[PDB]
């Protein structure tokens, strides 16, 4: 496929995504723990008509870290691009914001990067 | 002045900076607590020949959060620009990295923004 499918990040998390009508991303994000408690809803968007010059396909998605088993009062957004060609990959940067009081807002947002592959 | 002087962020921290030869920034960063224990060395760089088209002056600096009184095993970099004109301001985004073990690297880096004024 292109975007639709099962992907893995560098830590062993799983990104199970469908790239649907008119730019919708839906699916499930599974932490590296891999149990029922580790599965979360994701939703996002992607460019459904990318450039044809070799550039990647822009996309983003959000996980709110609540499921029926637990709640970490936080949400992560991944912003990135799908790179097709010989060895497909999704390269992202992410922002993890936790709910905080106003005085603790400096501690609210973590930043990092994840690369997803089909391996 | 332009950059050289005493500045304050939105939380009451103080940025005491000298913009010196050939692009050097040196000075002291003082947390909002304002006591001796709250003073840290800063060093950085700035564009000593900015554009003359109305654009700001790019700059950055680092504080390692160790002084003779305490050590938070962490460092913050502020990346931004000085905007002169009627009401001078330095607008920044910052990255606070704490030393972590490899398995805790996802918790390593906080991100935020600070605006400094001469008020």
């Amino acid at each position: 496929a292109g975007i639709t499918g099962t992907w893995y990040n560098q830590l062993g998390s799983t990104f199970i995504v469908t790239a649907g009508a008119d730019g919708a991303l839906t699916g499930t994000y599974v932490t590296a723990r891999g149990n029922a408690e580790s599965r979360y809803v994701l939703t996002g968007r992607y460019d459904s008509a990318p450039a044809t010059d070799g550039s990647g396909t822009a996309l983003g998605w959000t996980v709110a870290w609540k499921n029926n088993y637990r709640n970490a009062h936080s949400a992560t957004t991944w912003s990135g691009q799908y790179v097709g060609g010989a060895e497909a990959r999704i390269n992202t940067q992410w922002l993890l914001t936790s709910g905080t009081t106003e005085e603790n807002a400096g501690y609210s947002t973590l930043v990092g990067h994840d690369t997803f592959t089909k391996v | 002045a332009g950059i050289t002087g005493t500045w304050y962020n939105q939380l009451g921290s103080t940025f005491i900076v000298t913009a010196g030869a050939d692009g050097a920034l040196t000075g002291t960063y003082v947390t909002a607590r304002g006591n001796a224990e709250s003073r840290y060395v800063l060093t950085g760089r700035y564009d000593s020949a900015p554009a003359t088209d109305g654009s700001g002056t790019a700059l950055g600096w680092t504080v390692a959060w160790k002084n003779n009184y305490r050590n938070a095993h962490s460092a913050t970099t502020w990346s931004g620009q000085y905007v002169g004109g009627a009401e001078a301001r330095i607008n920044t985004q910052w990255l606070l990295t704490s030393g972590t073990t490899e398995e805790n690297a996802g918790y390593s880096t906080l991100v935020g923004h600070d605006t400094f004024t001469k008020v």
Partner: peptide, 8 residues
């Protein structure tokens, strides 16, 4: 303190 994004 433990966050699911980073759990093993």
């Amino acid at each position: 303190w433990s966050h699911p994004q980073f759990e093993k």
